[model samples]
Target chain A: DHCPLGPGRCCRLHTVRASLEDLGWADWVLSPREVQVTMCIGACPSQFRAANMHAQIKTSLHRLKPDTVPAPCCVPASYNPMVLIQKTDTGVSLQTYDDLLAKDCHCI
Target chain B: DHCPLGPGRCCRLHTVRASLEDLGWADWVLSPREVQVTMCIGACPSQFRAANMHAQIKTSLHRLKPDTVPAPCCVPASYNPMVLIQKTDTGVSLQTYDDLLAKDCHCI
Candidate 1:
């Protein structure tokens, strides 16, 4: 498909979805959805202009974690979904990691 | 002002703005802007339903850091804005803190 992004740059979502499919994760991928894009280190330099991108896929696969697969022509194996947490005592918190592994890490 | 939210619950944005105004932070606060709401812990339980809330204010005052002030009827004392970062090597990252203080806290 012709990439509308720019020369040498590809869509991170497309690459990630392709990679997921390549890895036989089609059953876990969501379509026409929104996944947070961190940075594109490969050929695409302008992909990070927006906060989030709309993904074209399907539901039922939404349960699959984002940024779990690698993106073609891009760095960062997967996309990291941003999570907002409202602490009980202090203030709001944002989670960057894929899961609780980075529990210790948070922005306050 | 009558709050359309629900009983025992107040609009967090309103409280924060009031506090900001009380503390003379009105010059820095942004109106009719979008601030990321991490959570609402005090009286309103359904305040966290939406990802982000539409603020009613003005520009020029948009430079103010969100969640820096306290929410009267809410816990956490302040609100935390969600920031999305695109990492070069890995994927996307989210920033939850007001500034770089929690630079190390990020989700993979």
Candidate 2:
């Protein structure tokens, strides 16, 4: 739809997962956990707009897979950042909350 | 369990689909069917932990090998988002179901 159609269509929202080659693009910025968290509550941008989003990354070893079962498999989308806003003693930890299988995450 | 092997384990419930250098990473936010109903209700948190109860997650992206053909192509997870209770809108969206053919995510 961004064209004459209108803006753009989507299978749904936006969630991605990258490939090994894709992971090598830049330094590690986000963690798998952060990526997972963001995927649950965020939207998806166009492939063209992804580059702009890359600048603010922090965790590493990422990928953005579809947020569902029987999903599709993509590359770089899987390897994105998993940034979170947790209250810290000073401010908050914007770091990757490492824990692919966190108990709290499961309890959600 | 944060040290050595004290804690950390997941291969069944965590369902990851990537082997492509873990995707270059960053620039995207939550999407992908919200990760498959957060992994069948989320609760599996440990490849080594005993889940005598349940698992929790907003969504979970697993594998999808048509015919189980035969190829451990651990390169990337599938890929987006949908809608429903996870949303705050006053509408009933039909993103209630999911698929693996998109990113080729099979199921858990």
Q: On residues B1-108, what C-alpha lDDT tens digit does candidate 1 reach at each position?
A: 344466434423222111223322235443323332222222222223221221111000112322221111221233234343333344444434352111111111
Q: Which one is best on DockQ?
A: 2
Quality of candidate 2 docking, DockQ: 0.04
Model 2 Cα displacement at B33 (Å)? 35
The residue ranges of model 2 lying beyond 4 angstroms of the native Cα positions read: A1-6, A12-76, A83-95, A98-108, B1-57, B60-108
> Which candidate leads in TM-score?
2
DockQ per model, Cα: 0.01, 0.04
